[PDB]
Structure 1
Amino acid sequence: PQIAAHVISEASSKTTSVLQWAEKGYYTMSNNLVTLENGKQLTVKRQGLYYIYAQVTFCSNREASSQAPFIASLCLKSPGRFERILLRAANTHSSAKPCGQQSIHLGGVFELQPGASVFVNVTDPSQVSHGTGFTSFGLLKL
């Protein structure tokens, strides 16, 4: 069966680094073999190869933030195994006034087992932009 997903971003009062998502706007959940759990992770029910992707857009400033880049990581929790990092991207903070906008895009082919969950986290969630289109997260089974 056709097993794919795409969920839009959603701001929250969390502080914690894990980005929140929602089945809203032009979202996709093909069937119950992919699920969005607690707004934070796309969990699969069948073993195999998936192309997982995510796009973080953020506005940041070099003076306001600490001397350290914006890192977005796409992580994997498999059942009965430790956390794992799959993809990462790093961007220096801009020198632009109020803030400087930039987008990251992560995408890759990984092997998910049954019950495996993937999620996207960031260094500073307060800097993540959440306008229509700008920040999204998805998956599709080969």
Structure 2
Amino acid sequence: GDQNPQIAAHVISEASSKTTSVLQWAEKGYYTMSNNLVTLENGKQLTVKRQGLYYIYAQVTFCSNREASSQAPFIASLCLKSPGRFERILLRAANTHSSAKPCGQQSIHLGGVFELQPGASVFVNVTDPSQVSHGTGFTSFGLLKL
């Protein structure tokens, strides 16, 4: 206050206690939720209350074994739920593990501009949630209205 009412979010990773495969987040650590027109709904997803173009991003780090998760690539997907609609993938990134190298810590950065409908919402899928790296700083998600 007053220095906020742009629409923007930045949210921090947290481990799911359920079989997952969508990422959970919190409003903790270095977080942003600049106003009531974004919210973290659990979800866990970022829900916008205004239509328009948004820059949307995620970062996922994981630590992984090649010979153990041999299935085969890690992939993180930015996905969209719009009201009364099926779900879409917006972005995906793959990284390999590569059989048989050891618990390698790797990151993924995803980002682009998309239209959102009022009522929104965006989330992140991964193939390998147990392998995900829970920070600090390592795994995050957010958006900004342009």
**TM-score, reference length from structure 1:** 0.95
RMSD of equivalent CA atoms: 1.3
Structure 2 stretches lacking a partner, 5+ long: none
For the residues of structure 2 that align with 1:30 and 1:96, how far apart are their CA atoms?
Answer: 44
Pick one of 12, 15, 27 that aligns with 1:11.
Answer: 15
Shifted more, 44-53 versus 61-70: the winner is 61-70
Which residue matches 1:92?
96
Runs of 4+ in 1 over 4 A off after TM superposition: 94-98
Q: Report the 3-state secondary structure (helix = DSSP H, G, I; strand = E; otherwise coil) of the residue aligned with 1:87.
A: strand
CA contact (8 A) 2:74 2:127 kept: yes
CA contact (8 A) 2:67 2:100 kept: no
Which residue matches 1:113?
117
CA contact (8 A) 1:21 1:39 kept: no
Q: Report the 3-state secondary structure (helix = DSSP H, G, I; strand = E; otherwise coil) of the residue aligned with 2:59.
A: strand
Q: Report the 3-state secondary structure (helix = DSSP H, G, I; strand = E; otherwise coil) of the residue aligned with 1:49.
A: strand
CA contact (8 A) 2:70 2:99 kept: no
CA contact (8 A) 1:89 1:104 kept: yes
CA contact (8 A) 1:3 1:33 kept: yes
| Aligned pairs (5 A) from 1:1-142 | 1-38=5-42, 40-94=44-98, 98-142=102-146
For the residues of structure 2 that align with 1:36 and 1:94, how far apart are their CA atoms?
Answer: 35
For the residues of structure 2 that align with 1:36 and 1:93, how far apart are their CA atoms?
Answer: 31
Structure 1 position 98, deviation (Å): 4.6
% identity of equivalent residues: 100
**TM-score, reference length from structure 2:** 0.93
For the residues of structure 2 that align with 1:12 and 1:30, how far apart are their CA atoms?
Answer: 25
For the residues of structure 1 that align with 2:61 and 2:55, how far apart are their CA atoms?
Answer: 20
Structure 1 position 94, deviation (Å): 4.5
